Subunit: 210 residues, 6 copies
């Protein structure tokens, strides 16, 4: 069957889990003990030689890298559950529009957002002091990025068009984490972003991985 080799707290792992749930699919979440360094030793390195979670299995097919896995799910299980591709899924122009947003989340949003979530949650869990200077710097960054998102969301219900797609889905785990932190201010202060956040984080598949 389908197996996800990861960790339930992992943003990348959650990104995959949401897509599976969105597709009403049954799978086994095989826990990788990162705490014991399992990810940096065999046999996990045979599933992903870069030693990051998640790795993935669908029968004989062996994948890693979360965005590639969500895409695979979106296509292989297209007719099942929520459509994660564009309504007209074979339309090349419309796919490109979606692809740009996917690309934007990876390059503009994730690095900043993940740094924020890490400085202000994960640090605190393990026992290091949050760097207020870093937080401020990255908040200023994310603010400028979210202004671009606001403009985009003023012209379309979701980022790739009129429907919820992979483009939106990929943001969810990081946003979830940032909503338990003062950085929520940036999402809330922007009307169309705030509505978008609220719609995508309130989805049942999104709540299943919290």
């Amino acid at each position: 069957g389908i197996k996800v080799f990861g960790h339930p707290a992992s943003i990348a792992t959650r990104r995959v889990l949401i897509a599976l749930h969105e597709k009403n699919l049954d799978f086994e979440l095989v826990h990788v003990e990162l705490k014991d360094g399992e990810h940096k030793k065999e046999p996990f390195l045979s599933r992903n030689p870069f030693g990051q979670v998640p790795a993935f299995e669908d029968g004989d097919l062996k994948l890693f890298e979360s965005r590639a896995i969500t895409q695979y799910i979106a296509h292989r299980y297209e007719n099942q559950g929520t459509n994660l591709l564009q309504t007209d899924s074979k339309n090349i122009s419309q796919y490109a529009i979606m692809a740009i947003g996917m690309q934007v989340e990876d390059h503009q949003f994730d690095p900043v957002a993940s740094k924020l979530a890490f400085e202000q949650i994960f640090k605190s869990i393990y026992g290091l002091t949050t760097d207020e200077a870093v937080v401020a710097e990255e908040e200023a960054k994310l603010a400028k990025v979210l202004d671009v998102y606001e403009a985009r969301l003023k012209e379309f219900k979701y980022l790739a068009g009129e429907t919820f797609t992979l483009t939106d889905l990929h943001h969810i785990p990081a946003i979830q984490y940032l909503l338990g932190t003062p950085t929520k201010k940036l999402f809330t202060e922007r009307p169309r972003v705030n509505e978008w956040v609220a719609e995508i984080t309130k989805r049942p598949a999104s709540e299943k991985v919290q």
Copy 2:
């Protein structure tokens, strides 16, 4: 027709240009004067609100972000010139394998490679001193990455399988730059990588953008 709004030295712009040439397509390269800050002002911000090159046009369709653009080219002009997708282009498993590698270039290769190319070439052009410490740090990184590439290339002719694909194409511009620098050692000292580099950089479409 087709317009590319970018700069001929730009890695991301070159990534798009190679794909166009590989597809034997005719296009106009519209030069964006980054030197005069054109990219950070209208009307370029209407083509890409994040203010990076390249932006792209195919008739009425307006894109940005290089990897999204190359994918669009690969699909919209699939029949034409070199096949940039997998031989069996509609096969979902085989697409996923390609998608992983595309993902790997973006996350594991590009950040390190670009930093190297920048510290060693672009700094020198302008007049800043190369940081020998940074170079060494990143070379150690890229080495570990390229070992994973060696292992992969021992099992397959190219990164996504038996054929040259987008996965390989996306590496070219950065590699081109690094070949004029002592970092070439890392590519040469690895047999299957060295052959792979040599095959992809010697392609006519790759040379047209040097």
Copy 3:
């Protein structure tokens, strides 16, 4: 009764838990949801205005800061379970010797060790890439620190003298995490350090918090 307001993965929280277990004390571990930003909001800020875990309660007495809490435990519940102070607990010279080591763990060991554990474990769990350069830098640091520990442990069974004390206890949570990482090499390669690590990590109270 006794309540610990923290998180079970937290190094500082574990430091307190071990001292409680070592004293055979009964307590409630009240989970603080850092993931929902509980620590940076009231009413937790009334228990610790710097918004870090753990906070602590012993009836009416409200404390924070792990080393202060372990000291309090060591004194208030002195006659009970393991002695965490020096054998001659009222001896001022012997206390000072212990105090130096406590001070050393805080200043020389913890910052480096925690950075290591964070770069290698906690980063991987959330989905950020380990910085191999940082790991190397800090491993070189810890090595130099652990050489000083080796010399010290060659003259005494434990760090403060012939008995296990707070000085040793405070190191445990960080060491536990580092034992599931290639940084174990540094502890193992040093004979008396390795014996010391093995003795303190194998204690029942130490294992209860793993």
Copy 4:
């Protein structure tokens, strides 16, 4: 007799010197020539293997690490001069309160304050340019920390209660340095902090080390 092995400009050394003076004790200040790298060679490494000042001697007893030394002084010479412990010195609850504050100075105050003092004073002495960006970053930090101090000092005359203690003493050397810098603004602009600074820096023992 009593020897302090250090340097008169050293914050950590001054911390010890103030405690000795506060206790009306006689001692020899043995100057360590850090300029000639004395601290990183024998025989100083036999007094402190981590090669930092100050080291300390009280007859046969050999100590290092300033906070451990001040605590030792506070206890060994308890009935002499100023009481540096709590009025009810054997009270375990009241000690813990003091211990928290000691812990807070070390973790929250000292790293920021010392960076400030270093960027603004020590850099200028030797001939490096002050980084205005760093100054600003750290001033923002210290401000937030000092707000917590303000709140605390609104409820108590000194940090550990109604009396001057080690908790307060340990702040003095760093504060002295910062008072000759625009960072004084942060101390002055906060009423109860300003009163506290003025009281502790005006003490005769505090002036003796300026």
Copy 5:
């Protein structure tokens, strides 16, 4: 004859080219292919062992380092074209005044200005994201520096006195680059600076290298 071994985009190379043009001299600009790492290999290392552009030749005389080369030009070809030294060129007091300004450009202006120009232009050309935080930090710096320039220019037509000298010349290439960036605001907002910029950048020799 005279040869300049450099690159036309290089600030340091331009600094030399302007001085040559200002002196109406004929020379060959020999292009060093930094892109192919020519600067870090022989035979260029025989012209400058630190591997930076520009190197320089005047018959048998072999020089490197731009400010030394411009000085050499200013003296060796003193009676030709524009006077780049002070009107009373042998006056030791007046030379010292010029020398201070030359020193000021190197230490106070260039490092900041070059970072700005690099973060905003050169990064964008090659494909890295501008760090807005860095930009802001350095803009604050340059502003303070330019206030000192404003005060100076209120008392004198140019930086070294009543005439255009090397002191002014050396600023040109960096200023040229910054004029195509929002950092122009800092120059425009200061009256005497703005006039100075406008005069020196509008000189025919300055325009020849744009």
Copy 6:
């Protein structure tokens, strides 16, 4: 007369003091960075960038150490040691000296000063960063190899005579000699050069 407004521990201030001593000149060393004097008036009227040293020779008001040493070298040329080239008006030979001066400022000083600071000045007040030390030592090593090659062809950096080019290195080198970085200075012709210039009476006075 001549005043130097600085601090005796300051590298830049020492650079000026050595040049004055080398020229057998009499001056007053006017001393408080500790009380933030450098960042307030009236010092800002002597140097608006708020760094030491500032300098006075009668009515003439200077700042910036390399500019001051050059001024000394020229205004008091016939007095004491010659700090310019033997043929002081020769434009080719001046340029050779100027390159070296430029090299010290750009290639040597930033690295050397970071080293001296991480290893000495930090310790006087903060923990030395062993990683930084190593990074910068690798840098300085490469720089000093270039110096070795240069010193193999000439007695001093600008030619056959001791000049400003050499002088400007002294204060930083002095500090680095009390530190394990001395090891790097393992380079024969560099070692001899360091020994000659640091043993000079004017060098020892500061």
